[PDB]
Design an enzyme around this catalytic site. Structure first.
Site, PDB file in Angstrom:
ATOM      1  N   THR A 200       0.742  -1.255   0.000  1.00 41.66           N
ATOM      2  CA  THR A 200       0.000   0.000   0.000  1.00 41.66           C
ATOM      3  C   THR A 200       0.777   1.315   0.000  1.00 41.66           C
ATOM      4  OG1 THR A 200      -0.200  -0.160   2.408  1.00 41.66           O
ATOM      5  CG2 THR A 200      -1.962  -1.125   1.097  1.00 41.66           C
ATOM      6  N   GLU A 201       2.102   1.250  -0.008  1.00 37.00           N
ATOM      7  CA  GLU A 201       2.926   2.452   0.016  1.00 37.00           C
ATOM      8  C   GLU A 201       2.389   3.645  -0.796  1.00 37.00           C
ATOM      9  OE1 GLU A 201       5.246  -0.897   1.516  1.00 37.00           O
ATOM     10  OE2 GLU A 201       3.765  -0.576  -0.068  1.00 37.00           O
ATOM     11  N   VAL A 202       2.105   3.444  -2.081  1.00 35.64           N
ATOM     12  CA  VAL A 202       1.615   4.550  -2.904  1.00 35.64           C
ATOM     13  C   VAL A 202       0.339   5.231  -2.410  1.00 35.64           C
ATOM     14  CG1 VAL A 202       2.675   4.087  -5.101  1.00 35.64           C
ATOM     15  CG2 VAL A 202       0.650   2.793  -4.402  1.00 35.64           C
TER      16      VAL A 202
END
EC number: 4.2.1.17
Lengths: 253, 253, 253, 253, 253, 253
Positions: free
Chosen positions: D130-132
């Site tokens: 989920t970084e983005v």
């Protein structure tokens, strides 16, 4: 078996004079322990490396030659991995390293010397990779050497196993400077200090870059550089430096 | 069209003097056949390579220039592949090879010479890659050249197409030694013999390593080296050598 | 801010004398616009590049140093990418480029100079990558440098940040020729013209090859070369050249 | 903050249930210390890795999100390097590792899970990078991911940041097996044991090989393989195995 | 020990039924000799490869297991190199190759099968790399495998040494098609013929490309492709094809 | 010949319905001009790409087939370079791209579609690389394909030249999603928007990373990742995101 004189420019001495500083497992380990401490000491900005005695590192470890031919495959691999961990640790060191080739550096030591960032050799010292002469392979060295000298120079040195002298060593790109017979160390400590005046951040990264690039395409390398060129622009040292410049004063990184 | 003088240090002569030893398809093939025999002869430890005549290899194959521009795409590719098979075979040779540049080496021959492990050039010989001057590309040579000299030196030689002389050729890293006008061969045979005194196992592998490394990251290279450093420690030659050392006697690999 | 003298051998001058030709964003852009026009001019076969003033390119852009440390991450990256687009465009240029180092070239300019195919330096000029001295990283340059000089030479130049002189610069492989104090340009224009006599096709491709090779294994490189060696054999320039040879007349590529 | 149940198949539990096992600096360090001990324990042949609680590893470290945006460039780099040291250590582990995805694995943990040799996921677990979604980049994961799944699958997962489910995760090649809701661990311990029956030497090396290959040309890879195929033929385990085969008995490596 | 049925789609049978077609040195050699003849036969456009008996290739060469553990380092390397020469020759074959997995393919044979361009497996056949189970390393196979399946799939197969079945083998990307129990060959010969209808030039090159690409950066790969895309446009087959298209007739390459 | 509907998620239509949207030089150019504008429009966060008509892109450019076989080597290369500039530009696009395969995509178009970040294909559409069937080589596509699918899948598609259907295309990793017959676009626009909700910075970089990694060793890749993981931590979007998280509100990147 190494002595360490802490300081902005730390100095590590291979302590085994009479044996001639062999890169024995024990010696390899002691050298690591130092690099660790020294890497952790915020006062140390550079590390000179030299040998105690008539040489830098060149002395058949008879204790080793006797065993080696009888060790088991699994033991041999386990060992190569340890020795390789040393070379790598040195070539990869976060801080600038400088080898002060006071005396002869043959085989193991020759690579150990080559693994340093810069090299200052005694005008009377010798250097050579003799592995083939007896049945060994300067494999671990090859890795660094292809990056240090031209292919034809690599073959020469590794196929003949000859020992080159200060004059040729520099000409080929094995050493950066030649100190007059007497203080290769003094001159190396000098070189170091200079490099140490420069930005700690800029140095590490420059080193980081020089590691990775050879192993990639032009464009990817540029992708890497760009990104770095970017990151570096938000570092304190840059802030510090640019200030010191607009204050006509020396930078205090 | 080549003559072979078998021996510990074998010697292959490009036999086409007056034509000046052109790397014609026929010549390329004859040279291979030799390398095969010679690779299979357990008495041969090294191979010197030189030319019969005023040159080493430098003579426009008019028979070729006339046809080439009319061959079909499929034929051209088929041919390049053959010529490339030669360069590769030489650069890849299992035994140490030494080019004895008695006379001029231009284009094809220049690469052929560069493809050897080591090069001994006649103090009066010339070397140059002239492809561009007429519309050709020293493509096959480029492969080796980027590994032999600095980028700026590569561009110079390939963009101008000039012929360099013994003095510059060594300085740049195109040749290892320069023999006084007269016996580039004698000196090359000398160089060879020396290399031949060393361990057959250690030599091959050292060569194997120097091939692969340039094409990989630092760590993978170390992974390769370590493994080799390991393997080599269970070879007879190492056993032989270490013994001969503890018996203060010459090694009989 | 650049002046362009069209011709078979075009010449581009960095026009910002008193500021000393800084590679400011504006300057970088003007230089590109030129390379485009010049790449599109069928009359231009080579491009010499030099500076107007006492230097080639070496002048702290105070306008830049003041801002930089305050720009946002996203802006910094956006900029590095622009500057990198310049270096790449130059290093990648389809036509032969030659840098005429009339005067000092420091940091940015030093890389700009290195990005050219060949370099002719004024016998009195200086060159150096000073980024680390102030907190910068010659990242974008590193990419080209590892291909131009030996690793030990790279470290020296980038870690000390010193300025080398014409004598050393050539010795290391940073420059091809040294012109007597006075006309580095004249000599560079000379060098260019020579290269320009050769086949336009053969030149480009030779350049194309030298780009890609460093980034690949021996065999793949040979796969590439072979294919090229092939393609080149169906080009007009080759047809033109081979004719001119059989007509003992100069080639009209 | 990890619990270790030593055994032929060791098991490490991420101990921070309620926080949901965040890969905090502290947690990363504790995990390393374990891998070291476990790598040094001659009784341990494999290591299963799982989490204590409803998840494997997925819990925003608010303590981290709060600071991060204020740390200095030099501190950020210093940290990334630490986290990267973890991923690498896991992906590089000398012994076979198996991730038992009992519960959710998001971002950091998702990569941690991917860094294991094999993965057994709970039929009800979820996985996702989920970084983005918040401004982060699954950079460290990308390294492994390009080797685990097709490019189009990589983009999907990293650009949308969605969480995939056991059914899709296997289909894409993110996980090897799916255990019925209940004992992903039990099944993982099972998988491990099986792998552990095989030769300790053969396993390590197979792993060593799979590391290096992706980063090299076909021929160099074959050069590497050949050499290994060779070395392996002088190892005790091979001796042991071949015997046990000719003695219709189980191998005792 | 192989039978060859020449034809547009040639078929090679591993002839050693009862022993189960072991990749013994002798067998490896016979297989090469065939590929040579077949590569030289202008009538052969494709080559199917299968085994005589209940299997494709899977049978412990006890004659081998007995010796191996006693051979010398130098002999082991010499042998690995021979076996590797086979895999490479197959994976590198100029003409399209298709493996018809009639029966079991384990270890050596499994790799031999994987080395083919395409694979058609018997709905009842099995495939597996068991090296680790006994102390061996599927090193030579690893080279191809990392390119055939995802990393996690590679680890699974090589660490467990299990045998997969037709259903899983395709799902993972080890085989292209599954023939109903009975004629994996018939179906493979079918597949081949189809591929054989296409352009001989386009096929080879497509293969050439797929070899080199994995080992290079995006841009270099594009440099390679572009050049090829170019060359291909001056080949007879293209001329032939485009004609046949404008003559609404079948192409006669 | 393309229509552009600006918006957060821009949409570009290949406008040449009856001809079936051929990737003619003209078409290639128009597509570039769009990508430029669209890359420069701060309102555009994603770009969907589709075709006007019964297909996406699949229509023999007879105007092209007629000429091609007569163009000169230099012209062919010049052209390949243009077409390659398109593929690259698309595969390299700074913003997320999504191909909406409404209808058939064959050869050129098939690659054009593959060059997009993600692909949504019409449940009734077809895709295939037919170059070999007529004498062409899907060279430019190969570059991307080796990264999109397993080697065996690559060979299949390129050697047979067959057209796959939505069901197989996804299974192999050629497309991410399959839309029910009717609105591949609607679904693609959907996919895009989702990706567009995420951080503009994080997206670009994630893409940048996925480009370079495949072309490098594990360690260098980690060197790259670490550096990125670092840089990203000083970007506004991260600041914005982390805030929005601590304000239980939607991020406004």
């Amino acid at each position: 078996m190494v002595q360490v004189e802490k300081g902005h420019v730390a100095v590590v001495f291979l302590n085994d004079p009479e044996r001639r500083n062999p890169l024995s497992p024990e010696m390899a380990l002691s050298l690591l322990q130092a690099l660790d401490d020294l890497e952790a000491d915020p006062g140390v900005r550079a590390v000179v490396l030299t040998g105690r005695g008539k040489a830098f590192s060149a002395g058949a470890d008879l204790a080793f030659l006797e065993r080696v031919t009888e060790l088991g495959a699994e033991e041999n691999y386990r060992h190569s991995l340890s020795l390789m961990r040393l070379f790598h640790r040195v070539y990869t060191y976060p801080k600038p390293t400088v080898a002060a080739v006071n005396g002869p550096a043959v085989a193991g030591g020759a690579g150990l010397a080559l693994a340093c960032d810069l090299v200052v050799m005694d005008e009377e010292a010798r250097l050579g990779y003799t592995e083939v002469k007896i049945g060994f392979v300067a494999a671990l060295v090859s890795v660094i050497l292809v990056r240090a000298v031209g292919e034809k120079a690599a073959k020469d040195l590794l196929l003949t196993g000859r020992l080159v002298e200060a004059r040729e060593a520099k000409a080929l790109g094995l050493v950066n400077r030649i100190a007059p017979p007497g203080k290769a160390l003094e001159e190396a400590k000098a070189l170091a200090e200079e490099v140490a005046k420069n930005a700690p951040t800029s140095l590490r990264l420059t080193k980081e870059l020089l590691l990775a690039l050879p192993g990639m395409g032009l464009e990817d390398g540029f992708r890497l550089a760009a990104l770095a060129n970017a990151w570096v622009r938000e570092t304190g040292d840059l802030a510090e430096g640019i200030r010191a410049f607009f204050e006509k004063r020396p930078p205090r990184f």
